[PDB]
Amino acid sequence: AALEVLFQGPGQPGFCIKTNSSEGKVFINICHSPSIPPPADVTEEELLQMLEEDQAGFRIPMSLGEPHAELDAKGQGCTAYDVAVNSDFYRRMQNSDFLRELVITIAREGLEDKYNLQLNPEWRMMKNRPFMGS
């Protein structure tokens, strides 16, 4: 459901999602920029029905950044990927847990497809960091 656009990141830091592959820790930096087009403007109700009809029916424009190696708060190596969405859409995500978690799934699956990874679906929001890296 990710519609990939090429965007040399990062935009503005947003929030940071911790997951992992079979080989190590992976962080998804959800960022935003006015450069990234928004998805179609729909209500939460209309969105729910689209997912019933197509698991990937709601296409979201986003960048899928190249991996960069970083050190976590404990000084250990990890991978970060910068994933940027539209700024106005990001504000909408801030006000909807359902919308935010949908976008996180689409970003995770987008990265899985692009980099041939299996990423743990049991992700967690980082509380001490909006962004892994500089």
Side-chain angles (χ1 to χ4, degrees):
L3 173 62
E4 187 180 350
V5 304
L6 289 82
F7 174 78
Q8 293 300 321
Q12 301 190 29
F15 57 84
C16 178
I17 300 303
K18 179 183 175 297
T19 178
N20 64 272
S21 67
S22 63
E23 317 216 12
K25 292 165 67 163
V26 172
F27 294 82
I28 305 173
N29 294 322
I30 299 297
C31 304
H32 63 88
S33 171
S35 273
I36 315 289
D41 191 2
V42 300
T43 72
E44 183 179 2
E45 296 83 356
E46 304 165 324
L47 186 43
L48 272 185
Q49 251 323 115
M50 293 181 194
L51 299 181
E52 296 282 343
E53 300 168 333
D54 186 348
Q55 163 271 3
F58 182 67
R59 301 276 289 171
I60 305 183
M62 57 177 62
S63 61
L64 300 172
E66 293 286 330
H68 51 108
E70 303 294 345
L71 296 178
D72 59 26
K74 289 307 197 18
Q76 294 300 313
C78 62
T79 303
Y81 298 92
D82 303 346
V83 173
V85 299
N86 174 261
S87 289
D88 291 312
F89 182 64
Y90 179 88
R91 285 197 327 264
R92 290 185 49 168
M93 291 166 53
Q94 288 182 301
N95 295 131
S96 175
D97 276 325
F98 160 77
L99 188 56
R100 184 181 328 113
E101 300 201 350
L102 174 62
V103 175
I104 292 167
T105 295
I106 294 170
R108 186 179 55 82
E109 291 183 350
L111 295 170
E112 284 184 328
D113 289 342
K114 183 172 177 182
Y115 298 110
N116 191 28
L117 259 49
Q118 290 183 344
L119 294 176
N120 189 358
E122 306 304 318
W123 58 259
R124 290 300 187 275
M125 171 83 63
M126 297 296 284
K127 299 176 192 255
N128 67 332
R129 160 187 279 109
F131 186 96
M132 175 65 73
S134 300

